[PDB]
Homo-oligomer: A and B are copies of this chain.
Amino acid sequence: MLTAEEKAAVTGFWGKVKVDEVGAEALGRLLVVYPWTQRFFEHFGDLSNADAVMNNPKVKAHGKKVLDSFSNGMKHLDDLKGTFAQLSELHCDKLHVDPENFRLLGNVLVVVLARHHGNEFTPVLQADFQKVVAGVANALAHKYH
């Protein structure tokens, strides 16, 4: 739900994004900058500081997994709720993650793209990504809006 020209710039950019390390970085950064989200992942072992978190193989693995579904919804921009409906139910009904956190992961995602892509992360381009992250965030919030 993003004017054609907007899907174009976003999807086009997205091919240049190494999903594996953006994923890992994204998720580690979330757990460091927002220390309470750690509660959800304490099964990943040692998260006592940002070296243990950033190097923890299991955070690294989950990073790819998260951005893989992200990078999948990127192919269905007209139907976010559709795709993420299932993952909504996990996060909302089994995991009990508060929706404000989906928005926090989007924002950190944005920051990482910035870090990897320099002045190519143009202001106009970010605006589009901000629309991509709120969309995913709603999709995910779905299973109780």
Instruction: List the interface of chain A (C-beta within 8 A of B).
Output: 134-135, 138, 145
Contact = CB atoms under 8 A, between A and B. Distances in A.
- Stoichiometry, as copies per complex, reads 2
Identify whether the interface residues of A are mostly helix, strand, loop, or mixed.
helix
A138 B134 contact: no
A28 B126 CA distance: 38
A27 B26 CA distance: 41
**Most chain B CB within a 10 A radius of its CB, from A135, A138, A145:** A145
Contacts of A134: 145
Nearest to A103: B145
A134 B135 CA distance: 18
A145 B135 CA distance: 7
